[PDB]
Design an enzyme around this catalytic site. Structure first.
Site, PDB file in Angstrom:
ATOM      1  N   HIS A  41     -36.633 -13.912  39.362  1.00  0.00           N
ATOM      2  CA  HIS A  41     -35.239 -14.161  39.707  1.00  0.00           C
ATOM      3  C   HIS A  41     -35.056 -14.528  41.199  1.00  0.00           C
ATOM      4  O   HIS A  41     -33.953 -14.921  41.564  1.00  0.00           O
ATOM      5  CB  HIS A  41     -34.279 -13.060  39.248  1.00  0.00           C
ATOM      6  CG  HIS A  41     -34.413 -11.760  39.970  1.00  0.00           C
ATOM      7  ND1 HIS A  41     -34.869 -10.630  39.319  1.00  0.00           N
ATOM      8  CD2 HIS A  41     -34.077 -11.431  41.239  1.00  0.00           C
ATOM      9  CE1 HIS A  41     -34.833  -9.660  40.217  1.00  0.00           C
ATOM     10  NE2 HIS A  41     -34.365 -10.093  41.388  1.00  0.00           N
ATOM     11  N   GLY A 143     -31.613  -6.467  47.402  1.00  0.00           N
ATOM     12  CA  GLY A 143     -32.742  -6.867  48.233  1.00  0.00           C
ATOM     13  C   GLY A 143     -33.985  -6.026  48.014  1.00  0.00           C
ATOM     14  O   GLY A 143     -35.068  -6.413  48.473  1.00  0.00           O
ATOM     15  N   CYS A 145     -35.496  -5.641  45.223  1.00  0.00           N
ATOM     16  CA  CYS A 145     -36.298  -6.301  44.202  1.00  0.00           C
ATOM     17  C   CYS A 145     -37.658  -6.692  44.705  1.00  0.00           C
ATOM     18  O   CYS A 145     -37.789  -7.090  45.849  1.00  0.00           O
ATOM     19  CB  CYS A 145     -35.548  -7.489  43.622  1.00  0.00           C
ATOM     20  SG  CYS A 145     -33.995  -7.024  42.837  1.00  0.00           S
TER      21      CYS A 145
END
Ligand SMILES: *CCC(=O)N(C(=O)[C@@H]1CCOc2ccc(Cl)cc21)c1cncc2ccccc12
Ligand SMILES: *CCC(=O)N(C(=O)[C@@H]1CCOc2ccc(Cl)cc21)c1cncc2ccccc12
Lengths: 304, 304
Positions: A41, A143, A145
């Protein structure tokens, strides 16, 4: 003595964290050898997340659109591929700090440490467990991730989790390092509700053993039970069924304390039925289930 | 979202841990620049601990009696001195991994991370607080002595604790890095009982703010209180008195949530008087006091 929710030393994993930017999205990446792993993503805008077709969005991206920064130095991306829900960005430089490592897919009930990162920089380390509904209860902000979960066996880091998503309920979902989500979750901003978050029985028993080892013994009763009688009570309290495999895994703790596994099950049964009565076990007012039997032996024996 | 008991990334401190042996006693040391810091009880036998005269025992020791091993390489000891309850072993090699560092003495209520070590090797990292009775509730086994407590501010490690002792009650005592014990403890195997372990009120309030930020709001009531009325209740429940200084420190959390500090005090007062009623706050059945207001802001904002 003393029993703490302990994470593995994070140094070996800190040396792997990088920042990955694709256009306007920045997240964390894991740099092992000459490959940087990150959630796919990273290629999406917030609008793309609603209904992303990753293969199609990826066509619009080239090696030079993935900006990888290790510390404050840029890495050259010479290849990119999608594996399930992760991107593998081949870089021209092998990570000099690459530890011995493995990629493993853990089972529910298994614990691991998470090194929460932002912009490729570590913010903190904590311990958590893969819940029986395949979520994790982490601490992750926007953030985070690409932050990873891992275990260490002496000098080998076994990476088991990469953070991808927060569900509307505040629980977290992610993948193994092959990009396969734990549970039924998808990397799309859509209605995804978690199943029953049952208690990890074998872990509660391991922690009751840790309590006896550390001197908290008030809850030990004069009863015993059977696996079938125990499991009838466990089901009623949304605890996972206990199997003979779990009893076998608890063998070393049973031997160390001299308390038969089924006797500890009977103590846990009375705690479930009677409650704690305002008392605590290892400083907790609830039964802790994020210590595996292996974690208890490790902490109580001092494995480095 | 999510709120975890988070420790600082331990990499910078792992690079400092060494093994120190003096005769038959082996413990951990902290190697910063060309000095290795360790508990002075490394010179004692188990028999010496009963009534040690450290200055006298130290006369029988030379530089070559202190064996310092960094990883699996021996360091040359070229000087040794006692500062309070720590030994400083001057070595001929500056630690190449020495991070930017400070030595600080913390106040009760302040939190820090501990990197538990055995034989100079890291076993795990956990978060704890300096209790109001100057003990810490750690997880330390024999040989963990010399493990350190620290905080990190971006790239500077502020070392605040070095582990020395376990009291008969299973609680822990240690020194700052100048060798001064926290509290009234002495490095002698004698009867040392801890004082009242009161609850760190300002930290409980900070964690109630973290709960509101993360969506746990059931405990918010329709009341307010005053510092004096609150403190009458706090004293009765063995909570530390709340001061205007603590209210000032909670200002940023009050602003973020829009909940006045005294309104949160009134919510905490009802929780103390009514109990939790089988409910949980951030996954806990008891009020957590080992998160400072700074830790809450840090975790909820993502400082790296
Ligand atoms: C790394 C931030 C991030 O992407 N988070 C998300 O959950 C995304 C927000 C939009 O919806 C969405 C759907 C699917 C996937 Cl794979 C990711 C997202 C994110 C992750 N953890 C914690 C978060 C806290 C706050 C904002 C976003 C978070
Ligand atoms: C590093 C081990 C150690 O020295 N521990 C002690 O507490 C010593 C045991 C004898 O009594 C004593 C008196 C004073 C001092 Cl300064 C130290 C000791 C130790 C420390 N933490 C945890 C422990 C667990 C089990 C055994 C010993 C422990």
């Amino acid at each position: 003595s003393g029993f703490r929710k302990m994470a593995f030393p994070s140094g070996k994993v800190e040396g792997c964290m990088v920042q990955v930017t694709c256009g306007t999205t920045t997240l964390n990446g894991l740099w092992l050898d000459d490959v940087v792993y990150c959630p796919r993503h990273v290629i999406c805008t917030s609008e793309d997340m609603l209904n992303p077709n990753y293969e199609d969005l990826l066509i619009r991206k080239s090696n030079h659109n993935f900006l990888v920064q290790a510390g404050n130095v840029q890495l050259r991306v010479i290849g990119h591929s999608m594996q399930n829900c992760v991107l593998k960005l081949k870089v021209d430089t092998a990570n000099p700090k690459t530890p011995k490592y493995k990629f493993v897919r853990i089972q529910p009930g298994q614990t691991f440490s998470v090194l929460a990162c932002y912009n490729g920089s570590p913010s903190g380390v904590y311990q958590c467990a893969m819940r029986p509904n395949f979520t994790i209860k982490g601490s992750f902000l926007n953030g985070s991730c690409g932050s990873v979960g891992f275990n260490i066996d002496y000098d080998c880091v076994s990476f088991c989790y990469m953070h991808h998503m927060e569900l509307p309920t505040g629980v977290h979902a992610g993948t193994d390092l092959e990009g396969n989500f734990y549970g039924p979750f998808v990397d799309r901003q859509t209605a995804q509700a978690a199943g029953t978050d049952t208690t990890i029985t074998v872990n509660v028993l391991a922690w009751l053993y840790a309590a006896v080892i550390n001197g908290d013994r008030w809850f030990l009763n004069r009863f015993t039970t059977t696996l079938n009688d125990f499991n009838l009570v466990a089901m009623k309290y949304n605890y996972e069924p206990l199997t003979q495999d779990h009893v076998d895994i608890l063998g070393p703790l049973s031997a160390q304390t001299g308390i038969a596994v089924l006797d500890m099950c009977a103590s846990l049964k009375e705690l479930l039925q009677n409650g704690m009565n305002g008392r605590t076990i290892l400083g907790s007012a609830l039964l802790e289930d994020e210590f595996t039997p292996f974690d208890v032996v490790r902490q109580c024996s001092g494995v480095t």
